[PDB]
Structure 1
Amino acid sequence: YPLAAWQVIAGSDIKVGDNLTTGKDGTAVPTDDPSTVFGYAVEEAQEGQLVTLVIS
């Protein structure tokens, strides 16, 4: 069901607009190297909290 945005457990602290990639245990962590980027967060989240961001 093609989702435009997901809710993924943050593997660290994530700021709004941060590009995200996979982390430990499949968690979402901040990145900076295009290739690892699968989505951009739309809200701030602390480690262990869900963060919702658009795919793209």
Structure 2
Amino acid sequence: YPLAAWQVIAGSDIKVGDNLTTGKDGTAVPTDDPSTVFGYAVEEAQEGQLVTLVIS
């Protein structure tokens, strides 16, 4: 059901607007390397917390 945004567990400290990629064990982590980017956060999250991100 094509979603514009996902709720994904954070693998590390994510700030608002950070581009996200896969981390270890399927968690989401910040990235500065385009092509690994699958979306970006619209929420801030510590570690192991869920974070809403918009896929892009």
**TM (normalized to structure 2)?**
0.98
Q: SS of 2:25's equivalent?
A: helix
- Give, in whole Å, the separation in 2 of the partners of 1:3 and 1:31: 22
In structure 2, the partner of 1:55 is: 55
| Deviation (angstroms), 1:45 | 0.4
Identity of counterpart residues, as a percentage? 100
Deviations 1:33-56 (A, max 9, x none): 000000000000010000001101
Residue ranges of structure 1 left out of the alignment (5+ in a row): none
What is the RMSD of the two structures over their aligned residues, measured on CA atoms?
0.4
* Cα shift at 1:22: 0.1
Runs of 4+ aligned residues of structure 1 deviating over 6 Å after TM superposition are none
C-alpha distance in 2 between matches for 1:19 and 1:51: 12
Gaps in structure 2 of 5+ consecutive residues:
none
Equivalent position of 2:8 in the other structure: 8
> How many pairs align?
56
User: How far off its partner does 1:25 sit?
Assistant: 0.3
